[PDB]
Amino acid sequence: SPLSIKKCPICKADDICDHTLEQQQMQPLCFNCPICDKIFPATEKQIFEDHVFCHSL
Ligand SMILES: [Zn+2]
Incomplete structure (x- = not known):
């Protein structure tokens, strides 16, 4: 543990x-x-982040 x-x-x-x-x-x-309107599994959080980003970029 890192403690503190x-x-x-x-x-x-x-x-x-x-x-x-x-x-x-x-x-x-x-x-x-x-x-x-697309679903992204918890494991696809990375892909999801990139997906949502594309909509902001
Ligand atoms: Zn999207």
């Missing part, structure tokens, strides 16, 4: 905001894109 409070930053660009520790301690089971 020590959270690793996911992104530097996002650091400039309220990431909320509660969000880090939560692993979704499924995802649903409200922009394309």
Whole structure:
């Protein structure tokens, strides 16, 4: 165990905001894109993130 409070930053660009520790301690089971109506399994979170990103880029 690392002991003491020590959270690793996911992104530097996002650091400039309220990431909320509660969000880090939560692993979704499924995802649903409200922009394309596509579902992404918890394991596809990475693919989902890229998918949702494409809609923001
Ligand atoms: Zn989509």
